[PDB]
Amino acid sequence: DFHGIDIVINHRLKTSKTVPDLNNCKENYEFLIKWTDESHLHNTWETYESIGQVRGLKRLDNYCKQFIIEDQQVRLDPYVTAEDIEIMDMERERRLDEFEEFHVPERIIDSQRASLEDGTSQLQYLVKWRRLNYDEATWENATDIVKLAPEQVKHFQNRENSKILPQYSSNYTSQRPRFEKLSVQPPFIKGGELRDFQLTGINWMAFLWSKGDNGILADEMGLGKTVQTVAFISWLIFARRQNGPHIIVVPLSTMPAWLDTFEKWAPDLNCICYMGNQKSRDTIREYEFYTNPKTMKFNVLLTTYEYILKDRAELGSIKWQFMAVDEAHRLKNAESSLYESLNSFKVANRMLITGTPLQNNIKELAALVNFLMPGRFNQDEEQEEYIHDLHRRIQPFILRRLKKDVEKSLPSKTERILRVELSDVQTEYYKNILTKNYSFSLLNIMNELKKASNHPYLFDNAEERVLQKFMTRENVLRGLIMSSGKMVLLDQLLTRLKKDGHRVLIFSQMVRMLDILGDYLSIKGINFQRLDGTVPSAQRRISIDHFNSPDSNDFVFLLSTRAGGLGINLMTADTVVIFDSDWNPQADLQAMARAHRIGQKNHVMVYRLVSKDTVEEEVLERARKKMILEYNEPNAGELSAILKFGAGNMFTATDNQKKLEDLNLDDVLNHAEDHVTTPDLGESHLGGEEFLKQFE
């Protein structure tokens, strides 16, 4: 009824200036439109006079006002950094990449053929839109859905036959099946792999079920503990044929995650997301059960804690088999309505997830245990043994492994901090920049130093000034390398590891700096490409695929640090360089794990570069010290400190050059620090005393 403009997605050029005004827009562009009373396949490429009179029309103009005009305007400002731009760029991307998800269908809810205004009737569905929500799902024409979304359809019909429905569940009376052991991953888990330590995992949760005991998965974060739940569900269903209704509780941050993981490793499963509190609640009830006013038609549902109260009412009275919960450090508390309402639930079983063993908590120690098993349990010496007893007293219910325990299983790596002097040049630059000041601005001041520390060429007269020796090309490198602490080092670092054929990644904050290496490499004659927000998706894939080319001649590959946070896999490199790092260390690890990507085949060597007695190390010693408190810019406040000395202890220039002069790679590397980035993780709880018996 209310027909016209839901929202405006995009725009472009046509069939043939730089600061445009509305009129330009109006005249040179077609625009993308989700119409109201519609959905995202029904987006059209229209122009002003191709659409005409339509309700809430202004809200289109408003798009130009911001996304063409005032965006394009804003860029001009010379204080807008290059760095700044690529953000604005990666930004468009991110937005329009979300929209691309709304004509990707993920479920189907009702085969219900609709009569049409002829005498004709087509089979129309009822489509759940990915990244979208339960409110706002649309009936759409079968005929073309299917030729777009075969499986989710294929799934649909099966979705009410599926052998694995909930009531075909086998319910163990006096007894319950023998504990067993699976030395190889059972076919019915169809995703891909799972390193032995994965198997071992499921085995454990398994064996435990076949004791009637629930346990806790606390292996250090990012460690597969999702796949390890997913898988272990497949088992409950497909291996103890009981699979009534299952429920996993999740961080809203990561449910988009789980969902993929499911239709990756347990594709055949019928699992249900719980997003929306309003029109969802009501929508879902029309999907969850069977058509009658108590057949639950779904294998697995998933939520945020949120809906465990807004909807404890309905959910409370549901007969549940298995319950897990991710990043559930969240439930140390015994009053928090999670607890009170999760015990308000009917569960045969509990797996629990956290990346942590308890220390302090005595009451937490209780609340967690007393949650998953309602049947458990002075001078400071006496509260110290009690916590220590009840420590071991629950060894059997814990699984905890760390990096080192699965080093055999995984692409090990190695973070080294190579710290260099500043070139005689750099020194003097720094040192002068200092002079000028202390007389939000502090920022560029930081920047100038940051720049100085990386390379003098970032600055304007630099190169011109350096080479007062006229104009030769050998020389152009000669000064280009040697005026820079980092470069000098790096120079023979490549030289050397490019003798060992190490395929090499390099990141920086400063795209300008990238340019400069960009220079370096072409002069030296080395193959590579460059990346960052500037190059459009379309492009990227090609600078990428050429590096990962079956036997490519690219033997290095430049990137923005922010480029990293992308989603881009370059395992074809065995070695990462951080030229310089962020307020945020994670930004560096994102970028790291573009070759630390859990389908890596080498040992990954990671060199973080810092210049000695520079502000640089304060930024990095900051990084760690935050990025230990775990599981994007320095404060103006704190910033005062970080700058306000490092200045006269910054020694000679000609000294520093002397150092650089006959610097030796090896020493630098055998002197190299280590970047310590993990609270001592505690000890490995490698399984339950019992279980262990059954494996050897």
Ligand X SMILES: Nc1ncnc2c1ncn2[C@@H]1O[C@H](COP(=O)(O)OP(=O)(O)OP(O)(O)=S)[C@@H](O)[C@H]1O
Q: What is the DSSP string of 136-180?
A: T-B--BHHHHTTT-HHHHHHHHHTTT-TT-STT-----S------
Segment contacting ligand X by CB under 6 A, of 187-195, 307-315, 533-541, 565-573: 187-195
Segment contacting ligand X by CB under 6 A, of 138-146, 220-228, 383-391, 644-652: 220-228
Instruction: Tell me, letter by letter, the H, E, C secondary structure of 64-84.
Output: HHHHHHHHHHHCCCCCCCHHH
Segment contacting ligand X by CB under 6 A, of 174-182, 186-194, 403-411, 441-449: 186-194
Sites for ligand X among residues 542-601 (CB under 6 A): 598
Task: Select from 155, 225, 413, 512 the one that contacts ligand X (CB under 6 A).
Answer: 225
Question: Token pair for residue 91?
Answer: 């930004």
The answer to whether 61 contacts ligand X (rule: CB under 6 A) is no
Sites for ligand X among residues 466-525 (CB under 6 A): none
Q: Dihedral (C-alpha) 265, 266, 270, 276: value to the nearest 10 degrees?
A: -30
State which residue, 91 or 193, has the beta carbon closest to ligand X.
193
Segment contacting ligand X by CB under 6 A, of 222-230, 335-343, 552-560, 611-619: 222-230
The answer to whether 193 contacts ligand X (rule: CB under 6 A) is yes
Segment contacting ligand X by CB under 6 A, of 39-47, 188-196, 419-427, 601-609: 188-196
State which residue, 166 or 355, has the beta carbon closest to ligand X.
355
Minimum CB–partner distance for residue 331 and ligand X (Å): 14
Q: Which residues are annotated as a binding site for ATP?
A: 219-226
Residue with tokens 């929209």: 99
Judged by DSSP in three states, 538 sits in: helix
C-alpha span between 588 and 565 (Å, rounded): 9
The answer to whether 532 contacts ligand X (rule: CB under 6 A) is no
State which residue, 455 or 596, has the beta carbon closest to ligand X.
596
State which residue, 251 or 646, has the beta carbon closest to ligand X.
251
φ, ψ of residue 491 in degrees (nearest 5):
-35, -70
Residue with tokens 């760390």: 402
State which residue, 221 or 467, has the beta carbon closest to ligand X.
221
Judged by DSSP in three states, 366 sits in: helix
Residue among 574, 615, 612 nearest 592 (CA)? 574
The answer to whether 630 contacts ligand X (rule: CB under 6 A) is no
Q: Which residues are annotated as a binding site?
A: 219-226
State which residue, 192 or 256, has the beta carbon closest to ligand X.
192
Task: Select from 124, 185, 198, 508 the one that contacts ligand X (CB under 6 A).
Answer: 198
C-alpha span between 75 and 70 (Å, rounded): 9
For strands 504-508 and 557-560, give the pairing. Answer: parallel
Q: 248: which strand partners?
A: 302, 324
Q: What is the chain's percent helix, strand, coil content, to nearest 5? A: 40, 15, 45
State which residue, 216 or 488, has the beta carbon closest to ligand X.
216
Residue among 537, 598, 547 nearest 570 (CA)? 547
Number of residues in contact with ligand X, rule: CB under 6 A? 16
φ, ψ of residue 173 in degrees (nearest 5):
-85, -95
Binding mask 319-338 for ligand X (x = CB under 6 A): -------xx-----------
State which residue, 60 or 216, has the beta carbon closest to ligand X.
216
The answer to whether 224 contacts ligand X (rule: CB under 6 A) is yes
Minimum CB–partner distance for residue 218 and ligand X (Å): 9
Task: Give the chain's radius of gyration (CA, Å).
Answer: 30
Q: How far is the CA of 615 from the CAs of 105, 176, 257, 451, 626, in angstroms?
A: 51, 64, 38, 11, 17
Other C-beta atoms lying within 10 Å of the C-beta of residue 628: 13
Task: Select from 137, 149, 153, 223 the one that contacts ligand X (CB under 6 A).
Answer: 223
State which residue, 219 or 532, has the beta carbon closest to ligand X.
219
State which residue, 224 or 456, has the beta carbon closest to ligand X.
224
Task: Select from 5, 109, 165, 194 the one that contacts ligand X (CB under 6 A).
Answer: 194
C-alpha span between 528 and 524 (Å, rounded): 12
546: Cα within 13 Å, side-chain hemisphere: 15
Task: Select from 104, 142, 221, 668 the one that contacts ligand X (CB under 6 A).
Answer: 221
For strands 215-217 and 346-353, give the pairing. Answer: parallel
C-alpha span between 610 and 624 (Å, rounded): 14
Task: Select from 353, 592, 615, 660 the one that contacts ligand X (CB under 6 A).
Answer: 353
Minimum CB–partner distance for residue 600 and ligand X (Å): 11
State which residue, 596 or 608, has the beta carbon closest to ligand X.
596
The answer to whether 226 contacts ligand X (rule: CB under 6 A) is yes
330: Cβ contacts below 8 Å, ≥ 6 apart: 305, 338
The answer to whether 239 contacts ligand X (rule: CB under 6 A) is no
Judged by DSSP in three states, 239 sits in: helix
Other C-beta atoms lying within 10 Å of the C-beta of residue 79: 6
Minimum CB–partner distance for residue 192 and ligand X (Å): 5
686: Cβ contacts below 8 Å, ≥ 6 apart: 399, 400, 401, 405, 692
Minimum CB–partner distance for residue 328 and ligand X (Å): 9
Minimum CB–partner distance for residue 399 and ligand X (Å): 12
Segment contacting ligand X by CB under 6 A, of 217-225, 429-437, 544-552, 603-611: 217-225
The answer to whether 222 contacts ligand X (rule: CB under 6 A) is yes
> Interface residues with ligand X (CB under 6 A)?
192-194, 198, 221-227, 326-327, 353, 355, 598
